[PDB]
Amino acid sequence: MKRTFQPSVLKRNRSHGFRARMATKNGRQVLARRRAKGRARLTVSK
Amino acid sequence: AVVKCKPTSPGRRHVVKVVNPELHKGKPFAPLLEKNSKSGGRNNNGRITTRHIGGGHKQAYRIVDFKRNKDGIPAVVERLEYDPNRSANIALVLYKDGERRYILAPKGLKAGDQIQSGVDAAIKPGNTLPMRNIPVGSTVHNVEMKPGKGGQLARSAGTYVQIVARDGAYVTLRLRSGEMRKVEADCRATLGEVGNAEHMLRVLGKAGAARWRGVRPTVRGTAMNPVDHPHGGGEGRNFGKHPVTPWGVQTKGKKTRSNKRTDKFIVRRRS
RNA sequence: CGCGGGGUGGAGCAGCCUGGUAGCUCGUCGGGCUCAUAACCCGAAGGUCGUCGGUUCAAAUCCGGCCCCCGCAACCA
RNA sequence: CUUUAAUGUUUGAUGUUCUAACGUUGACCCGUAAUCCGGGUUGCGGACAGUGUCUGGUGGGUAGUUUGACUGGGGCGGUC
RNA sequence: AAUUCCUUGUCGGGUAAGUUCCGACCUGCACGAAUGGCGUAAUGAUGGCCAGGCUGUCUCCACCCGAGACUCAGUGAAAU
RNA sequence: GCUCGCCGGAAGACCAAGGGUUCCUGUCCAACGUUAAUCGGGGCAGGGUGAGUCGACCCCUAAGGCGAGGCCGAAAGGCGUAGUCGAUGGGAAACAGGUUAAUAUUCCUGUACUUGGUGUUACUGCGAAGGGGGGACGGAGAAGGCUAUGUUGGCCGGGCGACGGUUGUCCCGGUUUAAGCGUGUAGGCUGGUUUUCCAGGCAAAUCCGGAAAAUCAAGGCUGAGGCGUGAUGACGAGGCACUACGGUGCUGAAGCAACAAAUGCCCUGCUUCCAGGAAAAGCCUCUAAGCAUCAGGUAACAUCAAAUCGUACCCCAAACCGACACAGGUGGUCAGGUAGAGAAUACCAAGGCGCUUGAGAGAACUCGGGUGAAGGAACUAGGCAAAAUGGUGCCGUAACUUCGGGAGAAGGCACGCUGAUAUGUAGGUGAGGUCCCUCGCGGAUGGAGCUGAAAUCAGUCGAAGAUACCAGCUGGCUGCAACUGUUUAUUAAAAACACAGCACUGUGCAAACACGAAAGUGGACGUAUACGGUGUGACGCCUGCCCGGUGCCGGAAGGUUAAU
RNA sequence: AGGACCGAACCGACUAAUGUCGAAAAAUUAGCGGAUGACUUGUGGCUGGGGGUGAAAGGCCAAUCAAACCGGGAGAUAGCU
């Protein structure tokens, strides 16, 4: 079947990337929450 | 001209076209062409506000000089064009000084005709003049609402607005729907009936014949579940409700008109 | 099996509701009108109020058993 | 007390007219190479329209809930 | 009748035999005119029925060819 | 290594995506592999990715995103102008051969091209966020001209061949060659040139456009392929020479013709129909604000620069996505031989593999299949499944019909091979020779060679000549629905939905309506032959009666009636 | 010319068998329907939870839909086990 995940780094980096977060206020807090938790996999990038 | 094609296939056995031997078959005049981004019926939000709108075929927009500000200039009609945006035909007119412009083609207009505008113009089909210079009882089209606006009344295929009476600063008109309406005298109007008057006799025939027009399948309310439409539900086709729009607003007889700021202009409501 | 309604001159229907006097039309009889019938006009007779019993001063009427008819219901596994 | 007439006064409800509020998704100019917008001329409407507060009506478009128990299973019928 | 409860209604045709089928009669429990009525060539991986043709579906199964099943060596689960 | 078998429009060879060293070499076998394992996409160590011409970055935009100010909103924030980003779109420029354990249109050899700076020489007016041209475009259909490519022949080289034959019409292998430059053809498009004038193009204009005239009949733009050249170069079968015996070094003949021919190219063409088919920049060109002994531009030459990143390997799969070395899913390109209408299909070439548990047995029973006497649906809910029909040309073909169909209806006849008509016809292609000329890639004529259906007659073989693979079951009555189509991804594909058509009703434009606390958008850069909602659902004959109840519309005198 | 006809690629998914601790969390084999169109597909965007989308099944919205997933109200409440 056509699995529900056909990977494409452009789309993944555009709707889930570092800059996509730093755009809106809600996105800023997502980075903020993760930093308080101390997760190294901060976002999805290289 | 109206022609009923031969039933050589299912779907074709009902198609009636209006084939005009006067239309220029070549490419349109590039200078007056600009892109036309299709909407699909969605607003700024992207949500579908107007349904059944989308798909269709890519059709380029041709600007048209509805205003007709060039006055006292003897212009010559060059060739008739096909406009995918308007039900009526558009005549490409060439001005005396060398400027080419599109105009809504009237009934009695062919290649090589002469038309002029302004208050100078004579009473000849295709000419444009301020309505207080036109004899009452006559018929015009592409009528303006406010002076200098551009023209908004009777612009479709085969439509015409006949002037009834003119009492000085205001002109009384009988619109196409049978709606008596007033309008200030300084407004312009183009003489004659709008051509391609047999457009209403065009039966599309196929289902897809609506698909490449932009029309999208419309689902009836009696075939929907109660959480999707006020109508619907029932085990085995049942209606029993008072006919309404998808949002509860009564249809099949219900006046939704409520403007009041322009109620002063209406002399008679249609019947 | 249960619920509601009904049964009234020959026929089709009111009046019961809130008890004491039963009405309308057609039909019938007799008369008149016409050459004769019909129609029309005049007058009159005609109803154990389904049946039985009880309550009541008084019952078509209030209540109950039963007989006949009509409708609804007779469902869920 | 009733019916009433001239005047003065008091506000209310209509009709016509005007321009100054306001509107202007009419034309024109500038800011500005920008169809947003603002300011300025002018034309057209006009104390309307529309907005706020209060108020009556409609209102399953929308939301929160009710929708009994006994019962020789429950429903129906009956009962409290 | 995609509707008819009663009902496998009654008559005719089809079959040796037809509760389904086809054509009719009206006694329409409870068809019906845009929640459309009656027909309709073509079309339909559609529903019901008949005939020809063709066959292991069946009368009644029989044999054979490969893959497992079986034995041996290696690996080595699961439900409970 | 010798045989066997399988795919071969893939199970082959390359990219993007996505993975991230899985690529190659040495070495190791505990853990991974469903078996052992000196094997491996497993562990450890080392090596490998070389670009001015490929792509990205870059120039320029689409859908759309962000959005100085601005508008609007309790706040968050929303919308949007100028701008600025965003390819799957457009825009400058390279091919052949050789070489590695692995990379190469990137390295070497040979031969070329493009965008700019600086300087020199000779000329000359240059110059924008501005104007114009161009870029720049749809579907389908048919033909012509060619090429990739294939076959045959000529020719070169080798063999003459382990059971009968084969010096001959015998056999096998090879017969490969680009980018660029010049020529500018088959073909397509279009009348050029010169003078004058102008309310046209937010200003200007010598450019575009329009309006008058003269002169002459062509000039110009675009254009695959061919022929030369690139190249007495490379390559090249086969020998000659050294073996760590894997391969390296050396040398090297023929290298043309004919025909068939693409879904590729000319063609981003031409004709035709309609539903009527991006934008901006690069480039060309005209000027304004200005600058002129300048600065700049055109042409030639010399020199310099062309940076940063990716580049290995897999890419219809054991490396992507599916927990797995998983019978599934994954866009684009090239794509040969015989048969065949074909990318079907059968068997093969190139190329790559035998699917990572095996060995014996031959029971019931289970799955995939072959055949089956006599009967032929008697089976069963039901002809479910199997069986059967199956191609081409011709003959012939009903009810009914909207006169299109129905229809490939049904039902039939001939199909192989050989000779002959004809040492291969009709036809296609077409050199030499002859002639002319506005002399070249020309035209008439000419006809060898090559290639090649089909029709007929005659003869012959088998039970069977569409023999295999591939390849309709047909007819009759009738319900529903018109029809193509769409739907419950993972039990329901239909009578359900849609449908063109018809009707009703709403909306006069700051339109109704919808999203949105608002602005603002969609509706529509449309405007009543338009647009929203609803009901029905082709076409034909029609569509009766009721306004009591409910809803809606119209008129408001009277009663009643909130806030004030 | 054709929502034209037969039929591969491609897309879809009607019948039967197998499979159901499967090779597979709906596939395979043998047969099917459409196949110039209302066609299909690649890449890239817009619409979002009482909302989106829908040729309309109460189907789909990351294997979950008559109201998605994750965190928090919250150790919700439970005359029930």
PDB file of C-alpha atoms (C1' of nucleotides) in Angstrom, chain E residues 53-58, chain F residues 369 377 379 382-387, chain G residues 14-17 30-31:
ATOM      1  C1'   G E  53     -23.982 -24.192 -26.826  1.00  0.00           C
ATOM      2  C1'   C E  54     -20.281 -26.115 -23.557  1.00  0.00           C
ATOM      3  C1'   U E  55     -18.479 -28.662 -19.694  1.00  0.00           C
ATOM      4  C1'   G E  56     -16.658 -33.178 -13.424  1.00  0.00           C
ATOM      5  C1'   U E  57     -20.990 -28.698 -10.957  1.00  0.00           C
ATOM      6  C1'   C E  58     -23.728 -33.309 -10.310  1.00  0.00           C
TER       7        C E  58
ATOM      8  C1'   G F 369      -3.234 -27.958 -12.279  1.00  0.00           C
ATOM      9  C1'   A F 377     -27.282 -28.435 -14.737  1.00  0.00           C
ATOM     10  C1'   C F 379     -25.779 -29.844  -8.539  1.00  0.00           C
ATOM     11  C1'   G F 382     -27.905 -19.238  -8.193  1.00  0.00           C
ATOM     12  C1'   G F 383     -24.588 -22.378 -14.193  1.00  0.00           C
ATOM     13  C1'   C F 384     -20.473 -19.778  -8.405  1.00  0.00           C
ATOM     14  C1'   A F 385     -16.475 -22.157 -10.472  1.00  0.00           C
ATOM     15  C1'   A F 386     -14.471 -24.484 -14.671  1.00  0.00           C
ATOM     16  C1'   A F 387     -15.384 -25.524 -19.896  1.00  0.00           C
TER      17        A F 387
ATOM     18  C1'   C G  14     -17.219  -6.646  -9.442  1.00  0.00           C
ATOM     19  C1'   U G  15     -16.658 -12.577  -8.823  1.00  0.00           C
ATOM     20  C1'   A G  16     -14.315 -16.935  -6.835  1.00  0.00           C
ATOM     21  C1'   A G  17     -10.117 -19.449  -4.410  1.00  0.00           C
ATOM     22  C1'   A G  30      -6.642 -16.683 -12.369  1.00  0.00           C
ATOM     23  C1'   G G  31     -10.575 -13.605 -14.713  1.00  0.00           C
TER      24        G G  31
END
